[PDB]
């Protein structure tokens, strides 16, 4: 029931995050706004688990390490940092970024645990009931794009919560904000593809997601450079579709 999962996830995410967005500007109750955001983030995971509970392969993909293809380890570790530093290099012909290598941007230990927790709470849902529901009705290629769109529009309430990444980028420039929502599209394709190449291993998707977040924190870049990064992501997403195009369009 693909029509039920996403619409139910869409509404639960939207009720909790927009409530947390109201508290985020409240001068009285701002102290608790982050504990309302938590179930909002955890929604796709709990919805997915409930639908499954209401198969052994979900258990398998959760605990079976043998599903993982070790040939994809270099691309799991290295691709995002490579993309980031390439973006800085591509920036240089255009004005600025000489300073950027310095990586001036970026307590240090707990924020890791939070990033790993968010990568977990997201992928348990997306790599659970979510993408399987789409791939059953659709070709892999349009299932991945339908996922990319939903996942992008899933971040939509964050624009309205005080001091969030989505908030600040739109606060600064309309182009910085749109660039983010545009970048979720090829990002949803790359992570998805990586999951299939490792036999739908949810654990690997967690690691990959976590690694994408980590490198985006440690190796910080300006919003102007992130626009270039988005393009690099489209070129990588396009290249991946071409390499596995038979897999992408087969029925």
């Amino acid at each position, epitope marked *: 029931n693909p029509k039920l999962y996403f619409l139910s996830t869409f509404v639960v995410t939207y009720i909790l995050w927009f409530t947390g967005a109201y508290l985020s500007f409240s001068s009285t109750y*701002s102290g608790i706004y982050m504990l309302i955001m938590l179930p909002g983030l955890m929604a796709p995971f709990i919805i997915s688990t409930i639908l499954i509970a209401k198969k052994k392969d979900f258990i398998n993909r959760l605990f079976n390490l043998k599903l993982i293809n070790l040939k994809t380890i270099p691309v799991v570790f290295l691709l995002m940092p490579a993309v980031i530093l390439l973006s800085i290099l591509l920036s240089i012909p255009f004005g600025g970024s000489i300073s950027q290598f310095q990586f001036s941007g970026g307590d240090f230990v707990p924020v890791l645990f939070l990033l790993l927790l968010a990568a977990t709470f997201e992928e348990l849902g997306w790599r659970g009931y979510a993408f399987d529901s789409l791939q059953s009705r659709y070709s892999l290629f349009k299932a991945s794009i339908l996922f990319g769109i939903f996942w992008s529009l899933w971040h939509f309430p964050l624009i309205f919560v005080n001091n969030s990444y989505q908030y600040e980028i739109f606060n*600064q420039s309309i*182009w910085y904000g749109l660039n983010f929502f545009l970048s979720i599209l090829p990002m949803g394709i790359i992570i998805t593809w990586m999951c299939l190449k490792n036999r739908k291993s949810i654990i690997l998707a967690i690691i990959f997601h976590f690694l994408i977040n980590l490198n985006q924190e440690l190796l*910080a870049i300006t919003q102007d450079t992130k626009i270039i990064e988005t393009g690099v992501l489209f070129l990588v997403a396009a290249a991946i579709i071409l390499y596995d195009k038979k897999m992408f369009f087969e029925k």
Partner: antibody
Framework: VQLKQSGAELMKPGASVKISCKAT????????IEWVKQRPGHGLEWIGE????????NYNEKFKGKATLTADTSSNTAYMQLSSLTSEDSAVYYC??????????????????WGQGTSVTVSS | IQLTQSPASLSASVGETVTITCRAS??????LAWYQQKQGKSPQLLVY???TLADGVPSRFSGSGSGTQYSLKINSLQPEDFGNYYC?????????FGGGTKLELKR
């Protein structure tokens, strides 16, 4: 990184002033420009901010209409215009920058560099 | 959100250690900066995110606090540390500064 502001002004009530703030040493379009008011006995008071390159602005409600922020990216200069001057407008005016925006570990939530200040006096 | 500084005035001698406090009327989630201002000069940044030293700032300065209560500490005051001090929150517009604290030379 340096912010140089224009010189002192002496004005009749009802006139307008345009204060400039020239930026050197960084990319002018990628950082917030702040404007702060300081009178003796009133401490620091925030006026508003502009993001050059996008033209986005966040104003204090009190200075809406009173203060007008603009920015020219070809000359790396931010401007603030004070209209309908009265005695209350007599103060020192600063422009200041915010840090570059990063998701984690940034001086973005700080006024990290300041201009030297522009003294404005308004009297008949 | 209004911010309140105490004390308004603080008398001290070279070598002493002093602490200035800042109170927010609402939770500002560590979005707090501290500035120093000499007479006739512009404010300079000392600390942001409540806890982080700005570039060039001596390590005798330090900031702490959370929620609604924040403070700045100067360990072993130097002659150059005498002047004014302000706190400022960055949680939500409008940004407000504290009334300031004047650190004067004891006599």
């Amino acid at each position: 990184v340096q912010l140089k502001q224009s010189g002192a002004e002496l004005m009749k009530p009802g006139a307008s002033v345009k204060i400039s703030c020239k930026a050197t040493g960084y990319k002018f379009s990628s950082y917030w420009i702040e404007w702060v008011k300081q009178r003796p006995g009133h401490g620091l008071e925030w006026i508003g901010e502009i993001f050059p390159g996008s033209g986005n602005t966040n104003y204090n409600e009190k200075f809406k209409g009173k203060a007008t922020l603009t920015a020219d990216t070809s000359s790396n200069t931010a401007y603030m215009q004070l209209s309908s001057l009265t005695s209350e407008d007599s103060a020192v005016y600063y422009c200041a920058r915010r840090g570059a925006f990063y998701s984690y570990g940034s001086s973005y939530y700080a006024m990290d560099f300041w201009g030297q200040g522009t003294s404005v006096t308004v009297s008949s | 959100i209004q911010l309140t500084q105490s004390p308004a005035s603080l008398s001290a001698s070279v070598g002493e250690t002093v602490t200035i406090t800042c109170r927010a009327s609402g939770n500002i989630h560590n979005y707090l900066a501290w500035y120093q201002q000499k007479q006739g000069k512009s404010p300079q940044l000392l600390v942001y995110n409540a806890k982080t030293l700005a570039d060039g700032v001596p390590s005798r300065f330090s900031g702490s606090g959370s929620g609604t209560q924040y403070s700045l500490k100067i360990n072993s005051l130097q002659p150059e540390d005498f002047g004014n001090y302000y706190c400022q929150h960055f949680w939500s517009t409008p940004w407000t500064f504290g009334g300031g604290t004047k650190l004067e030379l004891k006599r």
